[PDB]
Symmetry: C3
Subunit: 144 residues, 3 copies
C-alpha cells in the first residue's frame, strides 16, 4: 500500500535469554538497538517488555560492580529467605515482589532514527528466579 499521509507503523521483534543464575542482569542494549534500526521507524517509542512475573526490565550503567550492587539491593529488598505466604506454593515469592516493584517494561524515545538514551544507560533483563531456559523479551517500536 502506497500511503500518502503520515501513519502509525508498529514493528515487533523478540529477544530470548537463557539465564544461568538465580539472580542475574543480562545486557540487551545492542539487541534492542539493532531492532530499532531494523524497524525503519525514525520517530516514535520503543517498548521493551517481559511477559514474565519473576523477571523485570531496567535501565542503568553497565559496570560490573554496579550490576552486583543492583542485584544485592534487590535481594535484600525482596528477602529470598523469608516465609512469604506465596512460598507455601512456590519458592519464589521474592522474585515476584522484585518484579512487581521494578516493572515488566521500560519505554524509550526513538528519535531521528536512534534509541534515545544516555551514554551510561543500558537496558537489562533482570532475572530473579533463574536459571530459566527461555526468558522472552518483546521489543515493540511504534511511530513514523
Amino acid at each position: 500500500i502506497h500511503h500518502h499521509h503520515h501513519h502509525m507503523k508498529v514493528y515487533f521483534d523478540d529477544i530470548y535469554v537463557s539465564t544461568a543464575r538465580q539472580f542475574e542482569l543480562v545486557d540487551i542494549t545492542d539487541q534492542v538497538e539493532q531492532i530499532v534500526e531494523k524497524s525503519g521507524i525514525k520517530n516514535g517509542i520503543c517498548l521493551i517488555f517481559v511477559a514474565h512475573s519473576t523477571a523485570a526490565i531496567v535501565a542503568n550503567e553497565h559496570e560490573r560492580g554496579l550490576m552486583e550492587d543492583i542485584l544485592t539491593k534487590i535481594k535484600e529488598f525482596t528477602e529470598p529467605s523469608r516465609s512469604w505466604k506465596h512460598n507455601l506454593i512456590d519458592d519464589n515469592a521474592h522474585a515476584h515482589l522484585g518484579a512487581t516493584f521494578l516493572g515488566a517494561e521500560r519505554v524509550f524515545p526513538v528519535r531521528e532514527g536512534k534509541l534515545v538514551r544516555g551514554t551510561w544507560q543500558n537496558i537489562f533483563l533482570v532475572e530473579l528466579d533463574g536459571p530459566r531456559s527461555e526468558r522472552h523479551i518483546t521489543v515493540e517500536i511504534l511511530g513514523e
Copy 2:
C-alpha cells in the same frame, strides 16, 4: 490515521491497603478498541494509588501489600503527615508508579500466564478510584 481508544474503569476500595484485579476489564477494552497492533496504557490519576502487574495468588497478594507497608511505613512520622496522614501511600505510589504499558499484538493484550493487572490502593477506603485505559495503535 492511527487509532487511539479510551475507556475508564472506576473502582471503589474497601480497605486501607488493597489489590484490585482489573485484568478482565483491561482485556475487554483492548477487545472493544478494535486495535490489532499497538500498546495498552493503564493509568491512575491518583497520587496514593498505583498500577502493578503480577500473579493473582492470594498469598502473593498479601505478600505484596505487606512488603509495601513495610517499605512505606504507615506508622512513621513522615513530614507530610503534619498535613495529612497518608505519607506512606504517596511514597508507595511514587515508587510503584501510576501506569503500566503492555503490548497489543495480533489483537491480544500481550501478557504472561501469571501476569495480572492490579490497582494498588494504599489509602483506602475510597469511593472512586479512576483508571484510564488507552489503546493506541493500528
Copy 3:
C-alpha cells in the same frame, strides 16, 4: 499520526533534589497540537529518574529521605570503587527513567495532586536532559 519532541534542561543544585517540571511538560503537550495520544517524559541519565506525585514540600522531603534510606549513600557498594554514586544508580534503577501519561481531548491527563518531577540523586549537575515526546492524533 503526529510525533512531537521537545527538551527540558535542568541544572540541579543539591546532591538529592526534586525539580517540578509539570508546567513545562504541559506547555509541550499544548504546543504539540496533539489531542489524543500519549506523553513520554524520559531522562537520558542513569543517576536521575522521573516520578509523579504531590507537590507538597513535606512530602518532597519524605520522598528523598526514603530514597536515601533505600539506596544507602554511605554504603561501600562495589561500584563506588569507580565513582561514589552507586546509591544514585540504585535509586534510578528502581524508580525508572520514564513516565507515560495519557493525553486526552487536548489535555495531559493527571490527578489534582499528580505533579511531574525530575529526581536528582547525584547532583549538582549542570545539565540534566529530559526528552518529552507526544505521540498521537
